[PDB]
Amino acid sequence: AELTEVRAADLAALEFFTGCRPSALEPLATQLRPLKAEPGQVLIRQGDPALTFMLIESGRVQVSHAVADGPPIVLDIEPGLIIGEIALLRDAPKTATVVAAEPVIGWVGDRDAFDTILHLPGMFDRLVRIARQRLAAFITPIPVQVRTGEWFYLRPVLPGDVERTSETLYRRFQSVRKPTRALLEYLFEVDYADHFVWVMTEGALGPVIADARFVREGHNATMAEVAFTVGDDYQGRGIGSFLMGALIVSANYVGVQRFNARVLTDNMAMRKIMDRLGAVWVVVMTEVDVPPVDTVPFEPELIDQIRDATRKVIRAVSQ
Ligand SMILES: [Cl-]
Ligand SMILES: [Cl-]
Ligand SMILES: [Cl-]
């Protein structure tokens, strides 16, 4: 096998693999297959099983999602990324068609080959960074005014945010067969189905200062646990209350009908949040229905923006 050495070689020369030694890519070489495609060619058809990912060396591709009612909704991406890795890890059927807009050169691997990549030095963080950059393009932070009169910016979490934050990861993602930590961790960073996190930032592109999440009690449950965090300087400023409003809009839109929570005696704040939905305490715990979108005290236009942001980010992460 001499191809393998030559393979490793081409791989090493990709932007994607900058700073890896060609030899250290030799096993991965054994697991990747080159692909060439012509303009117009389907690289991935909607309804296909998720069997492989593709690493594209060069060639612009076009992603579209066919809707049963009215024409397919379409988008470009430049090369240098991986496509199909979410569906692959989720074993879901593809929901979006992908077509070569330009001649396409690249590399196809299975899930084991993707796990190989995840373990190569530097590579898990690099993949998270590529995901973060791709997703940022689908986020417009929404300026929001908290009851203090301070302005912050509301946006879905991004891959890489340090607040995104193993056993908790499996106990969710239990539908991934024979998984690795690395596979679970990467899916965690790009998950907007089972997990939905809202972040509030100091300025439109500034640090996260608070966050709120729901975690469905199983892949697709209408019951979801909630948790809120608020940074140090920022307590008692109306923030968790606001985020809860964002969290309600997102739940409704994706069909989460119920919330549960539990934590410390100490943070009344959390009790006060659940309180406002008429919680039921039994360190303490509760369940509540998610109220109708009706009752979050935000302007209709803000409701539509939070829903569209929810829409866009889910759609980014649907392959
Ligand atoms: Cl891209
Ligand atoms: Cl699986
Ligand atoms: Cl580790």
Give the CATH number of the domain where residue 56 resides: 2.60.120.10
Q: Which domain holds residue 201?
A: 142-319
Contacts for 312 with CB less than 8 Å, ≥ 6 apart: 138, 139
Q: Which of 115, 141, 167 is the last residue of a domain?
A: 141
CATH code at position 304: 3.40.630.30
Q: Are residues 293 and 183 in the same domain?
A: yes
Closest CA to 46 of 77, 60, 76, 67: 67
Q: Are residues 152 and 126 in the same domain?
A: no
Strand partners, 83: 54
Q: How far apart are CA 305 and CA 42, in angstroms?
A: 33
Which ligand places an atom closest to the C-alpha of 119?
3
- Under 8 Å between Cβ of 249 and 307: yes
Task: Tell me the CA–centroid distance for residue 193 and ligand 1, in Å.
Answer: 21
Q: What is the Rg, in whole angstroms, of the alpha carbon atoms belonging to the chain?
A: 21
Q: How far apart are CA 36 and CA 104, in angstroms?
A: 6
Q: How far apart are CA 305 and CA 249, in angstroms?
A: 10
> What is residue 234's three-state secondary structure?
coil
Q: Are residues 109 and 176 in the same domain?
A: no
Q: How many degrees, rounded to 5, is the angle at CA 129 between CA 198 and CA 30?
A: 130
Task: Tell me the CA–centroid distance for residue 77 and ligand 1, in Å.
Answer: 5
Q: How far apart are CA 210 and CA 227, in angstroms?
A: 11
Q: How far apart are CA 21 and CA 205, in angstroms?
A: 35
Q: Is 26 exposed, middle or buried (0-12, 13-18, 19+ CB in 10 A)?
A: middle
Which ligand places an atom closest to the C-alpha of 118?
3
Q: Which of 88, 122, 141 is the last residue of a domain?
A: 141
Task: Tell me the CA–centroid distance for residue 43 and ligand 3, in Å.
Answer: 33
Q: Are residues 149 and 60 in the same domain?
A: no
Which ligand places an atom closest to the C-alpha of 77?
1
Residue 44 is encoded by which pair of tokens?
């991935």
Listed resolution, Å: 2.0
Contacts for 235 with CB less than 8 Å, ≥ 6 apart: 269
Q: Are residues 197 and 306 in the same domain?
A: yes
Q: Are residues 39 and 90 in the same domain?
A: yes
Q: Are residues 136 and 146 in the same domain?
A: no
Contacts for 132 with CB less than 8 Å, ≥ 6 apart: 158, 159, 160
Token pair 């191809």 is at which residue? 3
Q: Which of 141, 176, 203 is the last residue of a domain?
A: 141
Which ligand places an atom closest to the C-alpha of 174?
2
What is the tally of structural domains in the chain?
2
The b/e string for 142-153 (b: 16+ C-beta within 10 A; e otherwise) is bebebeeeeebb
Q: Are residues 54 and 105 in the same domain?
A: yes
Half-sphere exposure of residue 83: CA atoms within 13 angstroms, side-chain side: 30
- Under 8 Å between Cβ of 101 and 126: no
Q: How was this structure determined?
A: X-ray
Task: Tell me the CA–centroid distance for residue 169 and ligand 1, in Å.
Answer: 27
Strand partners, 215: 195, 225
* Ordered strands of the 33-37 beta sheet: 33-37, 104-109, 53-58, 82-83
Strand partners, 44: 98
Which ligand places an atom closest to the C-alpha of 129?
1
Task: Tell me the CA–centroid distance for residue 54 and ligand 2, in Å.
Answer: 18
**Calculated CA dihedral for residues 189, 190, 194, 199, nearest 10 degrees:** 70
In the chain, what is the greatest distance between 2 CA atoms, to the nearest angstrom?
68
Q: How far apart are CA 58 and CA 50, in angstroms?
A: 22
